[PDB]
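Run: sequence + glutathione -> complex structure.
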Amino acid sequence: VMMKLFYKPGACSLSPHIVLREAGLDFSIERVDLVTKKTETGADYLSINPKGQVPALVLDDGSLLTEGVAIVQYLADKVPDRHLIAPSGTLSRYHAIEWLNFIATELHKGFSPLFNPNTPDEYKTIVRERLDKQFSYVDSVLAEHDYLLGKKFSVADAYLFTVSRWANALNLQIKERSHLDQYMARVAERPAVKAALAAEDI
Amino acid sequence: VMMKLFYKPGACSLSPHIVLREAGLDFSIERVDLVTKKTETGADYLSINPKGQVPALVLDDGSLLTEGVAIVQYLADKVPDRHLIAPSGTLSRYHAIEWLNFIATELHKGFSPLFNPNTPDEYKTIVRERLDKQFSYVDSVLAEHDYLLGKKFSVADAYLFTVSRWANALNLQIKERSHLDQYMARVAERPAVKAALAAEDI
Ligand SMILES: N[C@@H](CCC(=O)N[C@@H](CS)C(=O)NCC(=O)O)C(=O)O
Ligand SMILES: N[C@@H](CCC(=O)N[C@@H](CS)C(=O)NCC(=O)O)C(=O)O
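>> structure
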């Protein structure tokens, strides 16, 4: 059975959406309303992913895989000739896992208060301040090489690109950002990235 | 030359501390003050880890590994005879990665606002309600087999055990916890876990 990605336009599921197109694998996509927990076909989303989140990926055996970090590694390992991630058993792969975790916990989850309407503006200010330093730090790494893990685009870039879009949408102040902005411009040119954004009607 | 772990007692660094002992690897440990950013020996911690957090592992080549999720996988892969995680490329490995990410992003990072005095009280209430649901979800999974990933103890259990201790220290409300509680008692009886806790003076 063909892989299916459950997504919501602009959410963190854009990351494995980009990876799927970079990978060349066959897949379909299915949009989810995150409030109603219904998919675009009317189906009950909690019946599919009990965690009620995107992304979730239906594998070719019918089983479900959740968590962006797990999904992009699963995909990249499926197409080793495309080198979307360092091979397993290498120190480089542990560094990739390191950066994937940083993005997931410090960038991605860092945004959570900003997307909750019940969050008092005084705290949002504090939260934005922390993200400033986190992205500024990322900028300092992007000063040393073209992509996050080095000279080549990787699944970690798909994830970073995705959450960096949120920073832009929320007009996040970022102290050091000249390399980050140039990087965002570079990644945005990739045909797979553009195809992902179009398919999500962005 | 042997591996060294930077840690603070009962912090998330307890997780790889446990894994090191479960793994039977030779290693030393070294404590870190998270305010002054000074190790127990004098050194500047920001020199060592610029993100200024524990855990951080010093590998044999002298290099540093950060992010607990990366550290525990590195250690597990080093001792396949101990079967502390499924081997790379297997579906079971992706489910372990999935759980590790859930623990890092949904449980671990969920605690951060609760320990921070700048968090508004009503945001803390929202966070507690979410952790109630997330731990209750974990509890329902633990009804199915002895440990988190199946019948065998794994690095995901070291991590889960570590963050669940915080739930207990805060007396967090968890609606379905009968399986979680039995699990916690079982894990706390493991010789490696006792030695970790004792070495950290807890
Ligand atoms: N730990 C999950 C977090 C996924 C996540 O936060 N998804 C958001 C979209 S950005 C979501 O689905 N929110 C809906 C909800 O939490 O109810 C992962 O890393 O994949
Ligand atoms: N993203 C890191 C988070 C690690 C972390 O938050 N460590 C805490 C201890 S529980 C810490 O060292 N805090 C000190 C600080 O933030 O300055 C990881 O997943 O390993």
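>> summary
The pocket of glutathione (ligand 2) is lined by residues A 101-102, 105-106; B 11-12, 34, 52-54, 67-68, 104 (CB under 6 Å). Residues 84-190 of chain B form a domain with the Glutathione S-transferase Yfyf (Class Pi); Chain A, domain 2 fold (CATH 1.20.1050.10).
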